[PDB]
Amino acid sequence: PQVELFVKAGSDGAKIGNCPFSQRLFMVLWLKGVTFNVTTVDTKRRTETVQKLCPGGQLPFLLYGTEVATDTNKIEEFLEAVLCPPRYPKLAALNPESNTAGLDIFAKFSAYIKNSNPALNDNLEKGLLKALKVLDNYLTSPLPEEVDETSAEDEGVSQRKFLDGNELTLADCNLLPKLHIVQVVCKKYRGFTIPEAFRGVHRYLSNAYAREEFASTCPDDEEIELAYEQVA
Questions:
Q1: Under a CB-based contact definition with an 8 Å cutoff, are residues 34 and 62 in contact?
Q2: Helix (H, G, I), strand (E, B), or coil: what is residue 38?
Q3: DSSP E strand stretches across 115-219
Q4: How far, in Å, CA of 190 to CA of 225, rounded?
Q5: What gap in Å lies between CA 163 and CA 140, rounded to an integer?
Q6: Residue 205: strand, helix, or coil
Q7: All domains of the chain, ordered by start, with CATH?
């Protein structure tokens, strides 16, 4: 059945633009293994067919067969329900927590890079670091799955590669596009890196950049930077 993902185009009007929700759905379709095409949209230069299929004008939108669906969270949950075993993998996380870990990081990052008032920098910046610390923590925590400490040098420390285990889940699809923007924009504009002592975070990102599902759906570094150039 025909699946076509509609995504934000970049500065040139055709390459993929900055947008973590676009990325998340793209990551979702990839991970399902279902065939799909992907279509980039210029919102200041909308095609006949784009107008015609989403008059509401929303991005991202999904065309499934002939039925249009909007709202990232709803499109994801639909795809998950629809694309089922035994044909397609279940992708939801198994630990309700994997769904909320790091969930507050993006807003904190946003409040921070948008702020222009020097006097209130340290608050926002320390808040962002704290929410990274809350994620790092979740990542180093052994999950129920694990419940076994093989090494002695690292007792009580998690070995897993992603939020919910050793496999990419729905939760990753949501956090990694957002985590990635955060890292790109903060580095570029402020010289702020995720401290190296956040070893869980750094392990997590090394593993996810070694997944083609994440790496090939990442907009150009340059494109994220341009998109944040004004607010920064």
A1: no
A2: strand
A3: none
A4: 12
A5: 10
A6: helix
A7: 1-92 (3.40.30.10), 93-232 (1.20.1050.10)
Q: Which two tokens stand for residue 191?
A: 């010289």
3-class SS at 62? strand
Q: Can you read off the two tokens belonging to residue 110?
A: 């946003």
Q: Find where tokens 């996810």 sit.
A: 208
In angstroms, what is the resolution?
2.3
Pick the closest to residue 25 from 38, 35, 15 (CA basis).
Answer: 38
> Which of 46, 25, 44, 48 has the alpha carbon at shortest distance from 36?
25
Distance CA 110, CA 43 (A): 23
Contacts with 70 (C-beta within 8 Å, 6 or more apart), sequence order: 54, 56, 58, 61, 62
d(CA 224, CA 181): 7
Q: Does 59 appear as a known binding residue?
A: yes
What's the N-to-C CA distance of the chain in angstroms? Answer: 43
Method: X-ray
**Among 167, 182, 177, which Cα is nearest to 214's?**
177
CA–CA gap between residue 67 and residue 211 (Å, rounded)? 31
